[PDB]
Design a protein around this nucleic acid. Structure first.
Lengths: 157, 103
DNA sequence: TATAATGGGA
């Protein structure tokens, strides 16, 4: 079991009316309290990669091998798409229902802010601990000990 | 009856699992390769390091001079090159257990 | 030099 430290910048769009304004975000607090449901729409096209997080989601819209936009779905914003779907510009990807929060195991820092009318365009820097289990066969020997702080590119087994 | 004596002695050593069999055979090959990279770093023969490692493992008791002065030179090496000393030691331990488990 | 083979016998 390797608990990775994953970081990523992702875009978001919500109404200005609901946004609880801050610059640095802690796990679990409220990012917005929506009065009515909101359709969070795609601003680009491509195929969606839906990675389910602890209590959040991340939409990856990609054309060819590159990425066109990184999308962040906070808690209380249920996705409207499925892993491996075609979407285009203007099609909603998630519906913000209720009051949306940061996931309990994720931290958001370096938030941007772009107000256009009642809509605000946020691009925040997320960090969270994503475990991943690994199977090792008899023809494999483990190199690192228990609790070994490891870095990317290093051989584990 | 010396045959019943020896069969009982090899009886104490349990058989080794396929995982242990791969692991011991791995440490053996790693130790043998650790010896060759010590013959490049220090510059002396393979069989010399081979016996000095065998000595310091399977038994305590030229014993005070040549054996200990070669081990002393090996002990006075950088950290990056003393890895292969430890790897050779446990590799020779693996050879012992690999033999004992298949008697 | 390589399938795998693992506690005797009167």
């Amino acid at each position: 079991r390797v608990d990775y430290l994953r970081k990523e910048r992702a875009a978001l769009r919500i109404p200005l009316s609901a946004w609880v304004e801050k610059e640095a975000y802690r796990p679990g607090e409220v990012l917005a309290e929506l009065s009515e449901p909101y359709l969070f729409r795609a601003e680009e096209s491509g195929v969606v990669e839906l990675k389910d997080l602890a209590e959040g989601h991340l939409i990856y819209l990609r054309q060819e091998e590159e990425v066109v936009a990184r999308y962040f779905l906070p808690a209380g914003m249920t996705p409207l798409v499925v892993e491996g779907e075609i979407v285009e510009v203007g099609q909603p990807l998630a519906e913000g229902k209720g009051l949306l929060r940061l996931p309990r195991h994720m931290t958001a820092k370096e938030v941007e802010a772009e107000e256009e009318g009642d809509s605000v365009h946020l691009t925040l820097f997320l960090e969270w601990t994503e475990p991943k289990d690994y199977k090792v066969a008899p023809h494999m020997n483990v190199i690192v000990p228990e609790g070994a702080k490891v870095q990317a590119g290093e051989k584990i087994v | 009856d010396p045959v019943r004596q020896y069969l009982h002695e090899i009886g104490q050593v349990p058989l080794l699992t396929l995982e242990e069999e791969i692991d011991l055979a791995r440490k053996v090959e790693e130790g043998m390769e650790a010896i060759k990279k010590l013959s490049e770093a220090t510059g002396l023969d393979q069989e010399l390091i081979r016996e000095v490692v065998r000595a310091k493992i399977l038994g305590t008791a030229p014993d005070p001079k040549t054996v200990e002065e070669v081990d002393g030179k090996l002990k006075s090496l950088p950290k990056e090159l003393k890895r292969y000393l430890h790897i050779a030691r446990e590799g020779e331990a693996a050879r012992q257990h690999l033999i004992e488990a298949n008697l």
